[PDB]
Design an enzyme around this catalytic site. Structure first.
Site, PDB file in Angstrom:
ATOM      1  N   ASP A   1      15.567  38.731 -45.079  1.00 22.57           N
ATOM      2  CA  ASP A   1      15.275  39.635 -43.975  1.00 22.57           C
ATOM      3  C   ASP A   1      14.687  40.925 -44.526  1.00 22.57           C
ATOM      4  O   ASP A   1      14.530  41.083 -45.760  1.00 22.57           O
ATOM      5  CB  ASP A   1      16.530  39.830 -43.081  1.00 22.57           C
ATOM      6  CG  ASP A   1      16.193  40.115 -41.617  1.00 22.57           C
ATOM      7  OD1 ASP A   1      15.080  40.647 -41.344  1.00 22.57           O
ATOM      8  OD2 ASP A   1      17.028  39.800 -40.733  1.00 22.57           O
TER       9      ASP A   1
ATOM     10  N   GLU B   1      18.233  44.580 -31.919  1.00 19.50           N
ATOM     11  CA  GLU B   1      19.137  44.746 -33.056  1.00 19.50           C
ATOM     12  C   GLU B   1      20.166  45.813 -32.676  1.00 19.50           C
ATOM     13  O   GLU B   1      20.545  45.910 -31.501  1.00 19.50           O
ATOM     14  CB  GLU B   1      18.390  45.008 -34.448  1.00 19.50           C
ATOM     15  CG  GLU B   1      17.577  43.809 -34.950  1.00 19.50           C
ATOM     16  CD  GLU B   1      17.364  43.735 -36.482  1.00 19.50           C
ATOM     17  OE1 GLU B   1      18.363  43.610 -37.315  1.00 19.50           O
ATOM     18  OE2 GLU B   1      16.155  43.764 -36.826  1.00 19.50           O
TER      19      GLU B   1
HETATM   20  O1  LIG Z   1      10.298  41.900 -38.430  1.00 25.68           O
HETATM   21  C1  LIG Z   1      10.721  41.099 -39.563  1.00 25.68           C
HETATM   22  C2  LIG Z   1      12.276  40.820 -39.474  1.00 25.68           C
HETATM   23  O2  LIG Z   1      12.847  42.146 -39.150  1.00 25.68           O
HETATM   24  C3  LIG Z   1      14.250  42.323 -38.949  1.00 25.68           C
HETATM   25  S1  LIG Z   1      14.223  43.923 -38.063  1.00 25.68           S
HETATM   26  C4  LIG Z   1      12.742  44.971 -38.557  1.00 25.68           C
HETATM   27  C5  LIG Z   1      11.417  45.292 -37.712  1.00 25.68           C
HETATM   28  O3  LIG Z   1      10.353  44.282 -37.601  1.00 25.68           O
HETATM   29  C6  LIG Z   1      10.716  46.564 -38.326  1.00 25.68           C
HETATM   30  O4  LIG Z   1       9.504  47.004 -37.621  1.00 25.68           O
HETATM   31  C7  LIG Z   1      11.806  47.669 -38.382  1.00 25.68           C
HETATM   32  O5  LIG Z   1      11.407  48.964 -38.826  1.00 25.68           O
HETATM   33  O6  LIG Z   1      12.810  47.302 -39.293  1.00 25.68           O
HETATM   34  C8  LIG Z   1      13.554  46.271 -38.640  1.00 25.68           C
HETATM   35  C9  LIG Z   1      14.904  45.944 -39.352  1.00 25.68           C
HETATM   36  O7  LIG Z   1      15.534  47.140 -39.856  1.00 25.68           O
HETATM   37  C10 LIG Z   1      14.929  41.126 -38.170  1.00 25.68           C
HETATM   38  O8  LIG Z   1      16.342  41.050 -38.445  1.00 25.68           O
HETATM   39  C11 LIG Z   1      14.249  39.723 -38.352  1.00 25.68           C
HETATM   40  O9  LIG Z   1      14.623  38.799 -37.272  1.00 25.68           O
HETATM   41  C12 LIG Z   1      12.683  39.860 -38.321  1.00 25.68           C
HETATM   42  O10 LIG Z   1      12.127  38.542 -38.456  1.00 25.68           O
END
Ligand SMILES: OC[C@H]1O[C@@H](S[C@H]2[C@H](O)[C@@H](O)[C@H](O)O[C@@H]2CO)[C@H](O)[C@@H](O)[C@@H]1O
Ligand SMILES: CC(=O)N[C@@H]1[C@@H](O)[C@H](O)[C@@H](CO)O[C@H]1O
Ligand SMILES: *[C@@H]1O[C@H](CO)[C@@H](O)[C@H](O)[C@H]1NC(C)=O
Length: 602
Positions: free
Chosen positions: A285, A491
């Site tokens: 992740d 989230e």
């Molecule tokens: O997006 C890839 C992966 O991410 C995590 S959350 C990710 C957001 O995409 C990003 O723009 C933001 O700033 O950070 C967050 C996490 O802190 C997610 O758990 C996963 O399902 C997703 O494929």
């Protein structure tokens, strides 16, 4: 001048071995590195032999970008990768988790919890199929979906990304996989990766494992359950994923009985790889390895060692690629991480790239651009939306006339509520932005727009977002449709211990329904406190997060189709009861899993 790995007629494993045997340590570690498009340039991609790129939520070339703009971006990055010595194409990933949802004009399908309510795995497959096309329309080859979490507590901010609290429903919905990737052939070996070709995408079963079982639904936290419950609840759908040839698996931020999934060699290597026989690639992740430590990022050297030794193949860095590459290089050079581990990671990455045809079609197909937002896909989303709705009440007393279905012809009707004309709200998180957004964020039809499109031309439709009781009583309305509910979240921002909808929501419903017979449409990512909304309303529909096609809602309100959706989760009486799941001891639901009233089409 023949090079076996470049020969499309050779078997995938021969191509993988031939390329691997030629690669430097730098080229190998490069494959293992995924970076955000925000930090990518042509030189960075070439100089660091980068294996993958992603767009995180809201990481777009610009607001409003067309499908072709996305293709040109992706192809510009690919051009740089193809220019390296070995010319290994990058794979580009994105969260297309309810359609190609970062993209303006993409069809936005209901979120997963709603899809769970349909009990229709073939529908979900067809959604996978349409989503692949809309992803390839933008030049992207890899979707981080499905989320096969089994959410055991609706206080979790990602519960809407789970099809059900019942692992059997989730298992049934792994049909998204062959929709996204294509159906595996007759004689397919469970665990092998598969993607049919350039009109399909690699999928990702996520997040391994127990992401939906965290204490009090705290996002990214600890899941406290014995092996037998882990294996009976949280694991099963991963085996279904193996049987359908899911190409990748992403690891969870969460821990299992105190052990970080991103450092869990027993589960990642011992179980997923050595027992389920998974042969695709395992991906971190976003800063998942950083979060191994407390505080996060405070011992990156250890994060790299622990994760790669645990069995992770590709790291979603996604920003500090130079530090990641420098650290892993040093670990290999110092004998801390054996070459055999690097070689395995790279074998798996290349295996996915070769299998899916990426060396044969590294570039976007401009003829696919027009797939974005295609009307056939919207019609599918509209079908899914309608099928997802769960009718919870249709009459205050058992002796009242049923309110639904409503008549399309009436002198004057009222549509009201914060969610009646707000596309962003009806799409929820992971739409345009990471957290979703408010208002007309993309192409779609709001509930108000759908009412206007549905009703007889003699029917006067009045909109008032938050009318008072006197306005309604004085309006001369036949009935009202009032829509309210949760604001978009993703989230941890959605982790919510009270689960009560924001005001004005309830107050609007009370004022509307106190003056005229009312159908309340509840937009939420999960069960929320609902007894007060119920007590006010003649009819109430749980519409979940139905996406861009609001006509799915009116298709059922006006009786074009009967309500068929069934709760895919338990609806609690009170949050003090939680966690509470179908099959528990103290099971005292307001509405049990499986509940849903029906109507007949008119
Ligand atoms: O997006 C890839 C992966 O991410 C995590 S959350 C990710 C957001 O995409 C990003 O723009 C933001 O700033 O950070 C967050 C996490 O802190 C997610 O758990 C996963 O399902 C997703 O494929
Ligand atoms: C309005 C209406 O026809 N409702 C009916 C329900 O009362 C009946 O149990 C069933 C029989 O098919 O079909 C539905
Ligand atoms: C769970 O959350 C608490 C804060 O609520 C935090 O202190 C703790 O580290 C978390 N545990 C894990 C394993 O993520």
């Amino acid at each position: 001048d023949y090079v076996l790995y470049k020969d499309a007629t050779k078997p995938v494993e021969d191509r993988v071995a031939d390329l691997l045997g030629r690669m430097t340590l730098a080229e190998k570690i490069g494959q293992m590195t995924q970076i955000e498009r925000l930090v990518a340039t042509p030189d960075v991609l070439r100089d660091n032999f980068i294996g993958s790129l992603l767009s995180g939520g809201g990481s777009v070339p610009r607001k409003g970008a067309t499908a072709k703009e996305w293709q040109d971006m992706v192809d510009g990055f690919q051009k740089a990768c193809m220019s390296t010595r070995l010319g290994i194409p990058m794979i580009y990933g994105i969260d297309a988790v309810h359609g190609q949802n970062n993209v303006y004009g993409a069809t936005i399908f209901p979120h997963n919890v709603g899809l769970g309510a349909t009990r229709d795995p073939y529908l979900v497959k067809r959604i996978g199929e349409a989503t692949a096309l809309e992803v390839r329309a933008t030049g992207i080859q890899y979707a981080f979906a499905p989320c096969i979490a089994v959410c055991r507590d609706p206080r979790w901010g990602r519960c809407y990304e789970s099809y059900s609290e019942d692992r059997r429903i989730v298992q049934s919905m792994t049909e998204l996989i062959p929709g996204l990737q294509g159906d595996v052939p007759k004689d397919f070996t469970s665990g092998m990766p598969f993607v049919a070709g350039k009109n399909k995408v690699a999928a990702c079963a996520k997040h391994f494992v127990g992401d939906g079982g965290t204490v009090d639904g705290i996002n990214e936290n600890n899941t406290i359950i014995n092996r037998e419950g882990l294996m009976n609840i949280h694991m099963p759908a991963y085996k279904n994923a193996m049987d359908k040839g899911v190409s990748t698996v992403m690891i969870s931020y969460s821990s299992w009985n105190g052990v970080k999934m991103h450092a869990n060699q027993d589960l990642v290597t011992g179980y997923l790889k050595d027992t389920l026989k998974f042969k695709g690639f395992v991906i971190s992740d976003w800063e998942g390895i950083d979060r191994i430590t407390t505080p996060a990022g405070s011992d990156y050297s250890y994060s790299v060692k622990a994760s790669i030794l645990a069995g992770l193949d590709m790291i979603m860095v996604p920003n500090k690629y130079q530090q990641f590459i420098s650290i892993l290089t040093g670990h290999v050079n110092g004998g801390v991480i054996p070459m055999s581990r690097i070689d395995d990671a790279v074998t798996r990455i290349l295996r996915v790239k070769f299998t899916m045809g990426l060396f044969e079609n590294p570039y976007a197909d401009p003829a696919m651009a027009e797939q974005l937002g295609k009307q056939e896909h919207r019609d599918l989303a509209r079908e899914a939306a309608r099928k997802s709705l769960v009718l919870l009440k249709n009459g205050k007393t058992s002796t009242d006339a049923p309110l639904l279905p409503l008549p399309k012809k009436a002198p004057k009707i009222l549509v009201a509520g914060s969610h009646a004309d707000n596309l962003g709200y009806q799409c929820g998180g992971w739409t345009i932005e990471y957290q979703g957004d408010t208002g007309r964020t993309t192409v779609g039809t709001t509930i108000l727009e759908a009412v206007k499109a549905a009703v007889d031309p003699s029917t006067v439709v009045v909109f008032a977002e938050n009318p008072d009781a006197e306005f309604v009583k004085s309006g001369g309305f036949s009935y009202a449709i009032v829509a309210v509910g949760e604001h978009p979240y993703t989230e941890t921002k959605g982790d919510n211990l009270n689960l009560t909808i924001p005001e004005p929501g309830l107050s609007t419903v009370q004022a509307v329904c106190g003056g005229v017979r009312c159908a309340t449409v509840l937009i939420s990512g999960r069960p929320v406190v609902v007894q007060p909304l119920l007590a006010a309303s003649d009819a109430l529909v749980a519409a979940w997060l139905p996406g861009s096609e609001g006509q799915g809602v009116t298709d059922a309100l006006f009786g074009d189709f009967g309500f068929t959706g069934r709760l895919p989760r338990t609806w609690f009486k009170s949050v003090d009861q939680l966690p509470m799941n179908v099959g528990d001891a103290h099971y005292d639901p307001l509405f049990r899993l499986g509940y849903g009233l029906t109507t007949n089409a008119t």
